[PDB]
Amino acid sequence: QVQLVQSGSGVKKPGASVRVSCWTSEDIFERTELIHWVRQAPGQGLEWIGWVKTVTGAVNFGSPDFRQRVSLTRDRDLFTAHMDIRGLTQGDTATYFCARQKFYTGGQGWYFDLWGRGTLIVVSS
Amino acid sequence: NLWVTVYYGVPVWKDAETTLFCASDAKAYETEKHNVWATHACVPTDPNPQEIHLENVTEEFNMWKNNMVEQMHTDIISLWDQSLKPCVKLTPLCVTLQCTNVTNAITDMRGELKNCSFNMTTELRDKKQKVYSLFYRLDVVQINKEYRLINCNTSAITQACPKVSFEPIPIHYCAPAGFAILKCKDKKFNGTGPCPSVSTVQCTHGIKPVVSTQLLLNGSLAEEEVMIRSENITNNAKNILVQFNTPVQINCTRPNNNTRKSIRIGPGQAFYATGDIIGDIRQAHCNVSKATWNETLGKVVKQLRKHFGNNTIIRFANSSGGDLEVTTHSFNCGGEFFYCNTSGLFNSTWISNNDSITLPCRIKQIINMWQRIGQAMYAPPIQGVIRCVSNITGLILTRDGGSTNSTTETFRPGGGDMRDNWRSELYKYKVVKIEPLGVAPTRCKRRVVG
Amino acid sequence: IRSENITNNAKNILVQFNTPVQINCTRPNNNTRKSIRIGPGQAFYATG
Amino acid sequence: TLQCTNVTNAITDMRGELKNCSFNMTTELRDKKQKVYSLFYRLDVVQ
Amino acid sequence: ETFRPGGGDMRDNWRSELYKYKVVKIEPLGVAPTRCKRRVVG
Amino acid sequence: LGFLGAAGSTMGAASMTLTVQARNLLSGIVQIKQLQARVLAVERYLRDQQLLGIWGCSGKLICCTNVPWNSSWSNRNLSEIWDNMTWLQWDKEISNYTQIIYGLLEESQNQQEKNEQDLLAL
Amino acid sequence: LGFLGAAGSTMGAASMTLTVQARNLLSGIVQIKQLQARVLAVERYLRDQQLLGIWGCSGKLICCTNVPWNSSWSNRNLSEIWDNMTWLQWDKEISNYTQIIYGLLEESQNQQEKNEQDLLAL
Amino acid sequence: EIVLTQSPGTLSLSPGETASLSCTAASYGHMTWYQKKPGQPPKLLIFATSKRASGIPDRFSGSQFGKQYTLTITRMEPEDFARYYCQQLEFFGQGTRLEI
Ligand SMILES: *[C@@H]1O[C@H](CO)[C@@H](O[C@@H]2O[C@H](CO)[C@@H](O[C@@H]3O[C@H](CO[C@H]4O[C@H](CO)[C@@H](O)[C@H](O)[C@@H]4O)[C@@H](O)[C@H](O)[C@@H]3O)[C@H](O)[C@H]2NC(C)=O)[C@H](O)[C@H]1NC(C)=O
Ligand SMILES: *[C@@H]1O[C@H](CO)[C@@H](O[C@@H]2O[C@H](CO)[C@@H](O[C@@H]3O[C@H](CO)[C@@H](O)[C@H](O)[C@@H]3O)[C@H](O)[C@H]2NC(C)=O)[C@H](O)[C@H]1NC(C)=O
Ligand SMILES: *[C@@H]1O[C@H](CO)[C@@H](O[C@@H]2O[C@H](CO)[C@@H](O)[C@H](O)[C@H]2NC(C)=O)[C@H](O)[C@H]1NC(C)=O
Ligand SMILES: *[C@@H]1O[C@H](CO)[C@@H](O[C@@H]2O[C@H](CO)[C@@H](O)[C@H](O)[C@H]2NC(C)=O)[C@H](O)[C@H]1NC(C)=O
Ligand SMILES: *[C@@H]1O[C@H](CO)[C@@H](O[C@@H]2O[C@H](CO)[C@@H](O)[C@H](O)[C@H]2NC(C)=O)[C@H](O)[C@H]1NC(C)=O
Ligand SMILES: *[C@@H]1O[C@H](CO)[C@@H](O[C@@H]2O[C@H](CO)[C@@H](O)[C@H](O)[C@H]2NC(C)=O)[C@H](O)[C@H]1NC(C)=O
Ligand SMILES: *[C@@H]1O[C@H](CO)[C@@H](O[C@@H]2O[C@H](CO)[C@@H](O)[C@H](O)[C@H]2NC(C)=O)[C@H](O)[C@H]1NC(C)=O
Ligand SMILES: *[C@@H]1O[C@H](CO)[C@@H](O[C@@H]2O[C@H](CO)[C@@H](O)[C@H](O)[C@H]2NC(C)=O)[C@H](O)[C@H]1NC(C)=O
Ligand SMILES: *[C@@H]1O[C@H](CO)[C@@H](O[C@@H]2O[C@H](CO)[C@@H](O)[C@H](O)[C@H]2NC(C)=O)[C@H](O)[C@H]1NC(C)=O
Ligand SMILES: *[C@@H]1O[C@H](CO)[C@@H](O[C@@H]2O[C@H](CO)[C@@H](O)[C@H](O)[C@H]2NC(C)=O)[C@H](O)[C@H]1NC(C)=O
Ligand SMILES: *[C@@H]1O[C@H](CO)[C@@H](O[C@@H]2O[C@H](CO)[C@@H](O)[C@H](O)[C@H]2NC(C)=O)[C@H](O)[C@H]1NC(C)=O
Ligand SMILES: *[C@@H]1O[C@H](CO)[C@@H](O[C@@H]2O[C@H](CO)[C@@H](O)[C@H](O)[C@H]2NC(C)=O)[C@H](O)[C@H]1NC(C)=O
Ligand SMILES: *[C@@H]1O[C@H](CO)[C@@H](O[C@@H]2O[C@H](CO)[C@@H](O)[C@H](O)[C@H]2NC(C)=O)[C@H](O)[C@H]1NC(C)=O
Ligand SMILES: *[C@@H]1O[C@H](CO)[C@@H](O[C@@H]2O[C@H](CO)[C@@H](O)[C@H](O)[C@H]2NC(C)=O)[C@H](O)[C@H]1NC(C)=O
Ligand SMILES: *[C@@H]1O[C@H](CO)[C@@H](O[C@@H]2O[C@H](CO)[C@@H](O)[C@H](O)[C@H]2NC(C)=O)[C@H](O)[C@H]1NC(C)=O
Ligand SMILES: *[C@@H]1O[C@H](CO)[C@@H](O)[C@H](O)[C@H]1NC(C)=O
Ligand SMILES: *[C@@H]1O[C@H](CO)[C@@H](O)[C@H](O)[C@H]1NC(C)=O
Ligand SMILES: *[C@@H]1O[C@H](CO)[C@@H](O)[C@H](O)[C@H]1NC(C)=O
Ligand SMILES: *[C@@H]1O[C@H](CO)[C@@H](O)[C@H](O)[C@H]1NC(C)=O
Ligand SMILES: *[C@@H]1O[C@H](CO)[C@@H](O)[C@H](O)[C@H]1NC(C)=O
Ligand SMILES: *[C@@H]1O[C@H](CO)[C@@H](O)[C@H](O)[C@H]1NC(C)=O
Ligand SMILES: *[C@@H]1O[C@H](CO)[C@@H](O)[C@H](O)[C@H]1NC(C)=O
Ligand SMILES: *[C@@H]1O[C@H](CO)[C@@H](O)[C@H](O)[C@H]1NC(C)=O
Ligand SMILES: *[C@@H]1O[C@H](CO)[C@@H](O)[C@H](O)[C@H]1NC(C)=O
């Protein structure tokens, strides 16, 4: 149950961009196949956003709205990952989480073994 | 009354893994004694046809669990690294570069050509020389006039030996004695599940170590129909192998009589770098038949609907982003390394109920093979002429994610994991071990004589 | 008490206790570390 | 060649065990030099 | 008599654990007398 | 039939090819990874030969013993087994008792026959 | 008695375990100095089989010859040897007789019997 | 049609009795389970195979038939009161809450 190091929280104006980051140990990073991002707005259930492949940088998103407004990157030498969100709206106020999967084969299903504490992004006037 | 009998030589096998023997065509070695995949020594190709058709025998296959893929992958890497290990040790080469764009060029303002001269060592410790070696933009970064090689903070930049050919050489894999390789004869096989008919062969055949990213090149074709193969359908983490039943021809070329300069940077320490370029300079590119591409995709679409329904829409799109290697199609031709923009191939939507496509390309000389961290190979320049003809045999695709309000699905190029290339040839085979001990009931009681 | 001989002082004696003697050893104090490249990717570690 | 003196402005335990030393070290580029600093134990160095 | 710490030869450490063990080889061939004549039928 | 071609035939019919199977690399003979493979093939071969020596079956492809067959492990007729089954199917049905049968062969047949012969020899 | 458990028993009693000893890695079978060790075990195993083949004793744990025992080799009683001694002691007792005995077995029995049998076969 | 749905929804519990939650889904994917308390990141409870996750104090188990998976929570202990979510690949259920 190792916690991932999560970047700090903050408040942004509508239309602003924001970067969210997380870090882990080199042993955890190397073992991780995928880094996933998920979101939870207050009063809402958990929503999957997308993932970035730790080896090739390939990206797979959920709703196309995220594809246009969100970019995911990774850096294998720093054992970190970053999420860049642009065009922020009041509806994007939510807790965002960094999560990792180390399951490598079909039939195992998706897992999130490791989680960051998550961070809050507030969008307002 | 029945008794125990023993039968040596019983034709029974069990699933097993063992290291396979490398076999290859010795003639390839004779023509290219320094070829990377041409074993100095090897087992003969053993082209002889299967003696056994295993009539009325069926067997279960699972290409996704087939570890012979890992053996192929491991050996390709090991051979690559050893053949280039002693070549030059150019890591000391990196110095501050100071320069501006090429001027008085004929051109095609492309920022691709950089004319750079930097201080460098000589055969004598006490003497220095100016190199004046050209570089591609992709291989350098700004410290804006000051430049550095892009991989300079990696452990070393090493030139590939100029004598070593990188042309793929067919590699056959042969069983150790007491082991055998089974081959599935089922037409249009998914590469998984029970095979209706199998055969036994001493070796695999026709496999080549062709390295490519988005497109599968010079591989085997399906006998009847385009096959859609994947570890699963619902898991978007997994890649899809398209497996064409027909080739699509693609031509690629590069301009224009780029000269080479030989520089000694120390005792016997040859270094090759790009010299001046004769005539005009045009962007490198590839050509795909448009008409052929339609028939090709139409067949793929018809097969995809079998998994998603006939009330669906199949949309294609260009890359999702990520490293240059996954976002572009890459290949090795003439010893030169190319990265190509394939978006011209995917701008279409397929709804149920002499022309060509030109794909621009770029060249860079510093390559980090197999996504290895901290190491890099410097390719020596190829002296002025690249001509390539190739057969596209499939694509590596991924399905887009998210919920839908419709029956539309979207597919993009993806993967970049080289092991998936190997799977396209190895899915037909399985490795098993033969057990020589069997016991059965009998009427005999072994009357003792003495 | 074990030895190759007991008269030859060149030889060592192995004492072989029948019980352990416990020891705590420690080292101060949050010494930091610095990572220095001394060449391309040539990481060198030194006390901060 | 290292050029240095004893560690100063330390909280301490004058023990001579530690020195604060600096030198001209190479960098990723043949053309550039850097000052590393850092600490050494007395046992690892000689005059 | 006076005793001091000494040695420093690491092989003495290994010996303190290995003294309990010995390596031998098994030799199957053997011969012994009996009353048998090896009767032969040809 | 050829090597393992017999696998599709009945157990009785398959016995015609036991020599052929012995010829087809069962011997462990291969015409640093390759070196290790050669050594392994030899070790596997010799192990099986040791078992035949232990059972008193050495030098023969087919060998009778005095050990009774545990029919409860098959629940089939003698002719049913020989004519209506392949060796691949058969091996699974009796795979659980390999260790038991092998132990019985040593104790009930081979060591005893040799000891009885020694009494006759003397 | 298990591997070498027989060493504590009399020579006669020990004969019951000869198969057990054959099973317990005498065979040379495994469950780059480690590779060389595997090769050596095989070479040692095959050599001993050859020697039995030369004697005509191959395939048997216990084998007789028409070569007479020399009472002067041990100066012990038949029952003394079998009941009052271990094999470890016995090996030491006749240890200098290996060269002569080994030669006699080949010359007096194996080559001779094969030639005489061939003549009967002609 | 919602790909993944969860039930019974929020329910009253009595410690000493064993609770159960379940979810259903389209296209036969594997299901896994997570739980969270306010202010905390979620924790993995149950694997696709029904195997207990590391760090789980032997109180969780489950099984499935067809399109439905059910999990049980031993003796409704108060330490386990949390929001619970069923997951299938990219989808999450609306979740449930354990109350006394
Ligand atoms: C991708 O991975 C998916 C997850 O592993 C695969 O889904 C599996 O697909 C098979 C075949 O359709 C399903 O098996 C069916 O099970 C139902 C009934 O329930 C079964 O299990 C219960 C509990 O042990 C048992 O009591 C029942 O008797 C059944 O054994 C049967 O009626 C069907 O005939 C069939 O057996 C798996 O259940 C299903 N797994 C899951 C988690 O949904 C999927 O097929 C994979 N995709 C590809 C392309 O391979
Ligand atoms: C080896 O050298 C390369 C090239 O200098 C290093 O890559 C560079 O790393 C820095 C730091 O992460 C990147 O800086 C970033 O620039 C963007 C530009 O807007 C800025 O927004 C970020 O906040 C950050 O400053 C830089 O772009 C990147 N260069 C390239 C070409 O990607 C690399 O990190 C070095 N290796 C190591 C291990 O240090
Ligand atoms: C890069 O710049 C160098 C330096 O100007 C070019 O080499 C010079 O070319 C002129 C042309 O007549 C000669 O007169 C100079 O003597 C050359 N320099 C030296 C050191 O001899 C070089 O050709 C340029 N390269 C490119 C690709 O433009
Ligand atoms: C090489 O060419 C590039 C492209 O023209 C130069 O970079 C540009 O320099 C002009 C000013 O002269 C700027 O206005 C552009 O925005 C620059 N382009 C960039 C930064 O992408 C470059 O300076 C020339 N040689 C160098 C930089 O050494
Ligand atoms: C790739 O280049 C080859 C030639 O090297 C092209 O083949 C020629 O195509 C023209 C089409 O009118 C024929 O007339 C020629 O006879 C062909 N030459 C041959 C067969 O040697 C080929 O079409 C090119 N491929 C693409 C996609 O342009
Ligand atoms: C790909 O197709 C283009 C367009 O047909 C080819 O470019 C032409 O090459 C001929 C050569 O004689 C020129 O005369 C044309 O003007 C070129 N067309 C252009 C530049 O638009 C290109 O060579 C083909 N690429 C191959 C075959 O690799
Ligand atoms: C590319 O370089 C080669 C030389 O390496 C050029 O070959 C020349 O071709 C002309 C043809 O009339 C001959 O007269 C020359 O003697 C050749 N030079 C040699 C053999 O060194 C070739 O022409 C060059 N291509 C271009 C486009 O310039
Ligand atoms: C792959 O798809 C992306 C869109 O998802 C393409 O994006 C275009 O990039 C060019 C160059 O920056 C822009 O001028 C266009 O406006 C972009 N289109 C958009 C944002 O819709 C991308 O070009 C495609 N392939 C590439 C860039 O190789
Ligand atoms: C891949 O090719 C497409 C099509 O040529 C590129 O999109 C064009 O990019 C240029 C600028 O470099 C724009 O002027 C064009 O209008 C774009 N065409 C469109 C948007 O249809 C795309 O950028 C290329 N991807 C690369 C180079 O990575
Ligand atoms: C692409 O596929 C075609 C079709 O299989 C290849 O052309 C065949 O090559 C073989 C071997 O020389 C010939 O026996 C066939 O008759 C050819 N088929 C024809 C001409 O229709 C072609 O060589 C392949 N291309 C590459 C680069 O491998
Ligand atoms: C060894 O014993 C000494 C003496 O008891 C320990 O030093 C003491 O550590 C405590 C820690 O709270 C201090 O309050 C005392 O003042 C220390 N005594 C001194 C400095 O004389 C020492 O830590 C022990 N070493 C171990 C346990 O490794
Ligand atoms: C030794 O170094 C570690 C950090 O590497 C120090 O850990 C800090 O502990 C405080 C306690 O509240 C935290 O607030 C800091 O955030 C921690 N540091 C980091 C980087 O997280 C530890 O306290 C240090 N010990 C001494 C004696 O200073
Ligand atoms: C070793 O010496 C260096 C250099 O004097 C010390 O680091 C300096 O500390 C002062 C005060 O904070 C800074 O103004 C200087 O810029 C620092 N120099 C460098 C290069 O960072 C260092 O603290 C000394 N180490 C000790 C005393 O342990
Ligand atoms: C594989 O299947 C074929 C077809 O069933 C077998 O052919 C048998 O041929 C013999 C000839 O005397 C007939 O008596 C059999 O009735 C045929 N089949 C059966 C099931 O009896 C063939 O023997 C099978 N396997 C082999 C031959 O190895
Ligand atoms: C080890 O020695 C003991 C004797 O000290 C052996 O015990 C024998 O047990 C049998 C059982 O019937 C008696 O008949 C013998 O008389 C006992 N021997 C003596 C000397 O009294 C024991 O069997 C020996 N170990 C082995 C493996 O034979
Ligand atoms: C070589 O070093 C000198 C040092 O003054 C510098 O001025 C010159 O530009 C360098 N030449 C290069 C980098 O080509
Ligand atoms: C491919 O898998 C599907 C899944 O049920 C199966 O029905 C089909 O027969 C398989 N086809 C082949 C050729 O293996
Ligand atoms: C591909 O085929 C479809 C259907 O005939 C056609 O509408 C489309 O224009 C074709 N694309 C081409 C020719 O590039
Ligand atoms: C280190 O190099 C600088 C020049 O870059 C030189 O002035 C200095 O004397 C050298 N070392 C010391 C201790 O000064
Ligand atoms: C065994 O085979 C014989 C001959 O076909 C048959 O009569 C007998 O009923 C069989 N026993 C069974 C099937 O148990
Ligand atoms: C062999 O016995 C084990 C239990 O010890 C059992 O699980 C297994 O299924 C049995 N195998 C067969 C073929 O009956
Ligand atoms: C027994 O020893 C005597 C010693 O002179 C020797 O002559 C005789 O041949 C030996 N017998 C055998 C069978 O070796
Ligand atoms: C065997 O015992 C008898 C007892 O009388 C003795 O005479 C004879 O010499 C013995 N044989 C030997 C010791 O070989
Ligand atoms: C073998 O020869 C040595 C030579 O002294 C002798 O001491 C020993 O007893 C002899 N052993 C046998 C079995 O004759």
Numbering used by the authors:
A (entry chain I): 1 to 35, 35A, 36 to 52, 52A, 52B, 53 to 82, 82A, 82B, ...
B (entry chain B): 33 to 140, 150 to 184, 188 to 309, 312 to 321, 321A, 322 to 398, 411 to 507
C (entry chain A): 272 to 309, 312 to 321
D (entry chain A): 128 to 140, 150 to 183
E (entry chain A): 466 to 507
F (entry chain G), G (entry chain C): 520 to 550, 573 to 663
H (entry chain K): 1 to 27, 30 to 91, 96 to 106
From the paper:
The only HIV-1 NAb target is the envelope glycoprotein (Env), a non-covalently linked trimer of gp120 (surface) and gp41 (transmembrane) glycoprotein heterodimers. Soluble recombinant Env trimers have been designed for vaccine use that are close structural and antigenic mimics of native, membrane-anchored Env, as exemplified by the prototype SOSIP.664 trimer derived from the BG505 viral clone. The soluble BG505 SOSIP Env trimer presents all known conserved broadly neutralizing antibody (bNAb) epitope clusters that are present in the truncated sequence, but intrinsically masks most non-neutralizing (non-NAb) epitopes. Although relatively thermodynamically stable in solution, BG505 SOSIP trimers sample different conformations that may reduce B cell recognition of neutralizing antibody epitopes via an immune evasion strategy termed conformational masking.
We showed previously that GLA cross-linking of soluble first-generation Env trimers enhanced stability and reduced exposure of non-NAb epitopes. GLA cross-linked soluble BG505 SOSIP trimer (from hereon termed GLA-SOSIP trimer) revealed near structural identity with its unmodified counterpart (from hereon termed SOSIP trimer), but containing defined inter- and intra-subunit cross-links that stabilized the structure and improved antigenicity. Here we have chemically cross-linked the envelope glycoprotein trimer of HIV-1, and observe using high-resolution electron microscopy that cross-links are formed at very specific sites within the trimer, stabilizing but preserving its overall conformation. Trimer stabilization resulted in increased neutralization breadth of difficult to neutralize heterologous viruses, which is the major goal of antibody-based vaccine design. They also affected helper T cell epitope immunodominance, an observation of relevance to optimizing vaccine design to elicit T cell help for B cell responses. Immunization of rabbits and mice with GLA-SOSIP trimer elicited antibody and T helper cell (Th) responses that differed in magnitude and specificity from those induced by SOSIP trimer, and showed modest, but significantly broadened heterologous neutralization of difficult to neutralize Tier-2 viruses representative of the global pandemic. Our data reveal the first molecular snapshot of a chemically cross-linked vaccine antigen and the adaptive immune response elicited by it, and suggest a path forward for the use of chemical cross-linking in rational improvement of HIV-1 Env-based and other vaccine antigens.
